[PDB]
Amino acid sequence: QNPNAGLFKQGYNSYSNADGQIIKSIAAIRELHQMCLTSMGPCGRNKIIVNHLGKIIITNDAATMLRELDIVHPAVKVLVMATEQQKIDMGDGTNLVMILAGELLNVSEKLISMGLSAVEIIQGYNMARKFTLKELDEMVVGEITDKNDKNELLKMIKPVISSKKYGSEDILSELVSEAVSHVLPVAQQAGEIPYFNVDSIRVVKIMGGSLSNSTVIKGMVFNREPEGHVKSLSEDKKHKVAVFTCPLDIANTETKGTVLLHNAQEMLDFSKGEEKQIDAMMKEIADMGVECIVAGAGVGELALHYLNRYGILVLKVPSKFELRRLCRVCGATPLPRLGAPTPEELGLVETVKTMEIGGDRVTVFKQEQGEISRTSTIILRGATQNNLDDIERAIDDGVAAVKGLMKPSGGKLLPGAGATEIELISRITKYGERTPGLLQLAIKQFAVAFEVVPRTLAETAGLDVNEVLPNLYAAHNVTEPGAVKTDHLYKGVDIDGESDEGVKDIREENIYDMLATKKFAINVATEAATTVLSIDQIIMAKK
Amino acid sequence: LLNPKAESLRRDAALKVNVTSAEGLQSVLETNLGPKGTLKMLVDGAGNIKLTKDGKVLLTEMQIQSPTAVLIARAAAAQDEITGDGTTTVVCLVGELLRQAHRFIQEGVHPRIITDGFEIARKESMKFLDEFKISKTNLSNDREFLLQVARSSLLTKVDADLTEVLTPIVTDAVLSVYDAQADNLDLHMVEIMQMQHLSPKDTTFIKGLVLDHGGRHPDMPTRVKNAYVLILNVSLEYEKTEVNSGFFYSSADQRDKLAASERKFVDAKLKKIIDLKNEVCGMDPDKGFVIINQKGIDPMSLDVFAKHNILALRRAKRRNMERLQLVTGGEAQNSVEDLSPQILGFSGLVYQETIGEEKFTYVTENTDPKSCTILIKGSTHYALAQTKDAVRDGLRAVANVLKDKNIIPGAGAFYIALSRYLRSANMNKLGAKGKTKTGIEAFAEALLVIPKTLVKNSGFDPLDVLAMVEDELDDAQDSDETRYVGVDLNIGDSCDPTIEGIWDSYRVLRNAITGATGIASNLLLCDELLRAGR
Amino acid sequence: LLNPKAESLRRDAALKVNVTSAEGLQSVLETNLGPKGTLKMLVDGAGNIKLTKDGKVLLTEMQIQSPTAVLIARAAAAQDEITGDGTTTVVCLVGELLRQAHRFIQEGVHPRIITDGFEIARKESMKFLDEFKISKTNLSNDREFLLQVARSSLLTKVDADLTEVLTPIVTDAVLSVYDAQADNLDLHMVEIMQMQHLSPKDTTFIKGLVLDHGGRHPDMPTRVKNAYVLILNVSLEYEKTEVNSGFFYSSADQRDKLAASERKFVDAKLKKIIDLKNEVCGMDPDKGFVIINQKGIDPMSLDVFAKHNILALRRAKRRNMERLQLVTGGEAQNSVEDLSPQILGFSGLVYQETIGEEKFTYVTENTDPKSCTILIKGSTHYALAQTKDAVRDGLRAVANVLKDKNIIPGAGAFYIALSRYLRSANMNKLGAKGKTKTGIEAFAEALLVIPKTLVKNSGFDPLDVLAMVEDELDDAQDSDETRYVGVDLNIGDSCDPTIEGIWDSYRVLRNAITGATGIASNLLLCDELLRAGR
């Protein structure tokens, strides 16, 4: 009896700005905004998620969690798609993009209720974004020389491990930086040819031990068994490795070729035929100097018997992704046939041995000097499986941080730990009074939206908001008796954890944020909030 | 007067429902009009995020049971097949015209006179349409004026930050494909490529043609300047018998015997291709040699092409090969035995963009390419859909500028002047009819919805900006010269649409008045909603 | 944000409901407006039935919860106390002015500009009010023109059959009590009495005063011509001894002896009264002697006065006796001993209407009566109330014509012209504001409701009559002359209001335009409806 006005389409869902859906869309994001507020920072924690298949995934990274969560509202999917922009390109800063984009909608909610048009809200952020991009170039304090030294890598990697896993940042930094120096060649002042990739560092784990007992290998590490009576090869230089896609067995016909026995006469011929043919093919491989054979397919019973007499190490890698990284080290190439070890396609390994690390004997793959490897692997050890899986996800974020050292402003850095977001407030408000017109409302609120980063770090650390926050404003804003500002520009936001009064200087712990990561995160978070504010209506249909 | 399972609206109740249902769709596309409008997200059942302001794309992605929007959907389909743009504006004209006419329905005005007042005003609108239009010269030096027309189409469908990026791209895309003569233009000759990797702000224009599958070898040269392109139909890759078979050699002597059978056809063609590089471009610097090779490449020829630094290509699209014949000029060579240097074409700098997932090849910098490629970049999927909608709407908007020599200024200059003219035309002339002038005034009052809508989405008072334009038009009527006035959305005051550079196509606005007249009239002509057929 | 036992409407919904509630009262009073209107019947629930076309009389009987209509009823309170007629016209001007402004409120126009636009147009209407008015002479020979003025008031409240009967009655009632000079007129001197059991077409005018109690006796003369009126204040009923005593009688014959002793006190006064008749014109022909005698009469004096052919009356109202002193001129005589012939007055033919239930004595044909009586006779109850509402509105309508020397033509002559003047004047002046144009245009369109409402009740198309009048006014301006045009309700075309005889008082339309604008402006000023005090 009671009609409904405004919907002429169908019984599907129609979201219009008349009832304030733009506020409800932010409220739905606000529910997931506080989710990321419990993630970023050293006080954050991983979330336990059980898949529909009965699998438990535990990770601290929020961008990975978004892939494991079911998103209903399509307005959140825009932020999820914008979050992947930060994870795919720079690989770091996903927490800075999602939290800021959620706060840009919070400060815009006060402008919508005030009566300010959403078009002038977007126009204000577009003008404030160009004002921020010009300041980020002048806010650079130090610059990474790209020396690729182990001590120089500890400066960038330490804050990357920070706000993910706390207390292990001293041990994990030496493990990650050691593997980076192994995959990087010797060069300087050359940005033409890229070197470091994201697959150059493999992460393996084993139960037992601790993080202090972990080591770093210069090449791929295999946790499986040698599958033969030969445990390891010798120490001789430049061992030959052959990768075979064809399985190890008597040569057959590509079409069918199933062995059948009609009579006992064919039994002695086919049994001895497999013995003479395989031994003849394995002998030609051993005569060429190949002490290691990589079999991508299954291995027969008679094949393992002859490889033990010739002293050839058996290796089986069914995964094609591991074979690609194997070609980058020794130079071997998979051969479509069996018994033809062409020396041009063969690889060279300096040292390959089977050693016991973490309680179990594993056969690793590494080098010494020649045949420089572009791929390395870090062996992790620990007594806690939950924290062990979290380090695996934390190293992957550190691998992408090394990639940010390339030509697009890789050396420049900005002070982190809340020091950058607060300093942007005084610089943007300086341009607020400079730009006349209605843009002053959106420009001032754009700088206030940066207060969520220092407030979240102080709230999760147990510090009083009424105490640390007014000290943060007085740290970046001071009155100097002179024309040139001086003394401390290094005052950041401190997590404490033991005790302190006021704040601390960033120069003590050398916690810095890359310019390429921060400048790219602001543009993504601005365009993400621009899309949400530009949508005043959402049309959906039931599935 | 009914049968079981029947619903029928009679008297004026059906007119009240049709106008009320039209007011709903009006407000949907009202906030989507103009560069200051709103960008709405539409997802039906696919989880696919799409943001576009085009009026026709909205109706195609949404299922509407309302019968009033069905005819409006047919109106947006006719505007795209003729004008190609302005689908949102036509809907806003039909919606408000029904509201102004519905108020006169309660007054007792019969809808036939309402439709008769529209046809009389439409004929008078065509008279002002020829007087208000501005004839643009056919000269090709108008690119500067084309930049103003290009921005008018771009600013509507994007956030206005991408307009400055696509301004040189879209403008140079039309002039490059269109030779300067009477002739005509073909938009199909301009290719569109889509990539989800790089940001949308980094997009650039491709003067030549781009292809997908390139040859993969570590020694291939990155940049080759002034290279000759050769289409190759023969297979450079090892082949097998139609029935599954393989060649397995047990000795080095059997290796050369079995492998030679597969490479016999390869080496016969391969040795004759490298001889062409010895005769042509052997000594000569600043030249190059490129192979198309629609079919695959064996790993043996990859080392041969690396010794001579020959750019290798394999698995080429057949549709792109027909365009390579136009861009490069080289004829398709079915057999290398008949290959001649006259078949070889000419191309400029060819450099391959190296990305792990996909690789590109640029045939660009050609003497007579006679083709264009618009490369669309974006981070997300909806950013690619919005940009692709702006390019396809931008190319079709500029297409009507060169074909139709007449141009009209935008920013409400055509709508405010026509609404004021038709109101003062019937008062001075008095040649229409005594009773019909009521329905004619409804059409004149319905022409001001667009300038009031442009300022409504920007938050400005539509009554304030309307009085400022009328004060400028009265000053223009006092002077005997010709001065055009328009609404400035950024500042909020009036503006000269010729200086600001806001221009609208003549053909789009010519069919907008006639199109919105017949569609809105048929909705008022419906007395009863008939439910039958079941 | 609420209080217990309270209801409130926020945003603009509080104003939209107040306008919508005012539109409901408009549609009720839209049907009864004008001579082509309808006669409404209201039922209190106690058995009372009233048929009245007046606006205020209906509003007082009706109970309305809507607070907007309450102010409309309060707005009409000052209309009847000043104008006395046209309360329905004022309501139609308030309602339509809110409907025309309702369209502009939905567009986002602030109500202050709408309110100020009505006040500025109100001041400009008063300037055009003095230009459009026609100055009428003060001569008393205008009764012929007053006949057409009386028809304007009468034709509205009746079926037009009683207009020709009430035209000479109402017109002569005002002119008789009004001596010729500037001065003024007093409608209190006109008494309205009623009697049932007769047809309404028998209504006649009474120049004198009508008395309630008539003389009862078969020998009393019915028609007496040229009789002397005598006001007698003594009691002629049975009297008692001046001192306290009692009646002691053995037989019934002795009771009459004691009773006759007290009856001699009355007989002594009766002998002195009859001596006055024989003293002055006792036997003279064409002469008569009539006794008023406010107090009662005993049955013995009825036979004494009948033998002398004297008209005797008893039990007269105290208020009606004060009029007999002014009309006849006879002084009040308290004592019979002091009775003198100088107290006797003079009167013309006195004839008594003989009806079993009631008898009326006519004091008419007097030298200086200075009073009048309008006798409204009808069979039913609503026939007495309908005509009495028309006479009281008719006497007050003619009153404003003689008091105010200015007269205005009716039949929409002022409403159509002022709506045309304010339309063309606002464009030429442009002295208010650009945003005020919405308020001025809304007031101009709100003045056309009356000419459309009058013709709508007649059945003719209000659209066709509007076009014919505007075409005739435009042709009159081209001829350079003064021609007034009005709506003819009988034929359906236009008419000359000066020839047809439809005229409206200047004071009625002056307070109508000012009153309807001020009250409707206060309705738009309402932000919120607050409920408190419960």
How would you describe this structure to a colleague?
The structure is cut from a larger assembly and holds one copy of chain A (543 residues) and two copies of chain B (534 residues). Chain A folds into three domains: 1-143 and 412-543, GroEL-like equatorial domain (GROEL, domain 1); 144-218 and 371-411, TCP-1-like chaperonin intermediate domain (GROEL, domain 2, 2-Layer Sandwich); 219-370, 3-Layer(bba) Sandwich (GroEL), CATH 3.50.7. In chain A, 44% of the residues lie in helices and 12% in strands. Chain A has 17 helices and 17 strands. In chain A, the strands form six sheets. In chain A, strands 7, 8, 9, 10 and 11 form a five-stranded mixed sheet that branches. In chain A, strands 4-14-5 form a three-stranded mixed sheet, covered by helices on one side. In chain A, strands 6-13-12 form a three-stranded antiparallel sheet, with no helix packed on it. In chain A, helix 5 (118-138) packs across helix 12 (419-432). Chain B has 534 residues and is mostly helical. Chain B has three domains: 1-136 and 406-534, GroEL-like equatorial domain (GROEL, domain 1, Orthogonal Bundle), CATH 1.10.560; 137-207 and 370-405, GROEL, domain 2; 208-369, no CATH class. Chain B has helices at residues 13-30, 55-60, 67-82, 87-107, 111-132, 143-157, 163-177, 252-279, 299-307, 318-327, 381-403, 413-429, 437-445, 449-457, 462-478, 497-500, 506-524; strands at residues 41-42, 50-51, 134-135, 190-195, 205-206, 210-211, 223-224, 227-230, 288-291, 350-351, 361-362, 372-377, 406-409, 486-487, 494-495, 503-505. In chain B, the strands form seven sheets. Chain B has a three-stranded antiparallel sheet with strand order 3-13-16, with helices on both faces. Chain B has a three-stranded mixed sheet with strand order 4-12-5, covered by helices on one side. In chain B, strand 1 (41-42) and strand 2 form a beta hairpin. In chain B, helix 6 (143-157) runs antiparallel to helix 11 (381-403) and helix 7 (163-177) packs across helix 11 (381-403). The chains are: A alpha/beta (543), B mainly alpha (534). Chain A binds chain B through residues 6-10, 12, 17, 74-75, 77-78, 81-82, 85, 116-120, 122, 126, 251, 253-255, 337, 339-340, 524, 530-531, 534-541, 543, and chain B through 21, 24-25, 28, 31, 36, 38-45, 47, 49, 51, 62-66, 68-69, 159, 161, 243-246, 248-250, 255, 379-382, 457-459.
